Design a protein around this ligand. Structure first.
Ligand SMILES: CCO[C@@H](Cc1ccc(OCCn2c(C)ccc2-c2ccc(SC)cc2)cc1)C(=O)O
Length: 256
């Protein structure tokens, strides 16, 4: 229905407008120039670009943090384009966002990642996968699971129009803890998922099973976030130099 066809465009619109990075321009950059960070020297050079006059692992740990806070803010504004979200109870908007933020972060970060590294610093830097592996434990275990997910997720060849609805569906999960009006959210969820399923059919006629694959990726993302939140706790509890942004701690607070 043209209403359905227009609903996807709505969400695709709010997506291109609230997220400073997207797959189309990330690929425009990844092709061909981002400053390559591939060893300790190039990391320190790139840092001096910002603070002219703690420990490499800990500085990286806070840079990623800065990207999460930004995306939390962007996701909230994006959520408005979903039919019914703004009509939901406030406490339920907070709960859906609290549990869907990191799932959406790691989903969208794939657009910026390839087998060799990922775009960082607003498209100005490119940090290598091998360098991230070379970091001392346990900071070297942060990103490699995100690359494994991203490599298989990107193999699905989704575009920003698909990821648009995928991220909306992520936020629209009816089985999040502490939801008051679970009934309305599931109806909200059913509407987003419906238009996602049909959009995938029309946009990817060469892969009719793309929708079941994305449902599986949704569950993979959930497990990916649970494990990531755990590793953050280990770093926070240990590594006495590793602070945790307070807005991010409130997201993890009572999550998994
Ligand atoms: C361990 C923290 O985990 C976060 C979740 C999370 C994990 C990886 C991520 O990729 C950010 C990109 N990147 C990496 C991989 C190293 C350094 C940067 C970087 C360099 C310069 C800048 S300039 C602002 C920004 C980022 C983004 C968020 C959380 O829990 O919030």
């Amino acid at each position: 229905t043209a209403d359905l066809k227009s609903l996807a465009k709505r969400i695709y619109e709010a997506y291109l407008k609230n997220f400073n990075m997207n797959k189309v321009k990330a690929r425009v950059i990844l092709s061909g120039p981002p400053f390559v960070i591939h060893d300790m020297e190039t990391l320190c050079m790139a840092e001096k670009t910002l603070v002219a006059k703690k420990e490499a692992e800990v500085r990286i740990f806070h840079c990623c943090q800065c990207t999460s806070v930004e995306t939390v803010t962007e996701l909230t504004e994006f959520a408005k384009a979903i039919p019914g979200f703004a009509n939901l109870d406030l406490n339920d908007q907070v709960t859906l966002l609290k549990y869907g933020v990191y799932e959406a972060i790691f989903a969208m970060l794939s657009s910026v990642m390839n087998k060799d590294g990922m775009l960082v610093a607003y498209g100005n830097g490119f940090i290598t996968r091998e360098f991230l592996k070379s970091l001392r434990k346990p900071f070297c275990d942060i990103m490699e699971p995100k690359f494994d997910f991203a490599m298989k997720f990107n193999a699905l060849e989704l575009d920003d129009s698909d990821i648009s609805l995928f991220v909306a569906a992520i936020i629209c999960c009816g089985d999040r803890p502490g939801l008051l009006n679970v009934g309305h959210i599931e109806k909200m969820q059913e509407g987003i998922v419906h238009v996602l399923r049909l959009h995938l059919q029309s946009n990817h006629p060469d892969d009719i099973f793309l929708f079941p694959k994305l449902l599986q990726k949704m569950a993979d993302l959930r497990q990916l976030v649970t494990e990531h939140a755990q590793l953050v706790q280990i770093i926070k509890k240990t590594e006495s130099d590793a602070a945790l942004h307070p807005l991010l701690q409130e997201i993890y607070r009572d999550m998994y």
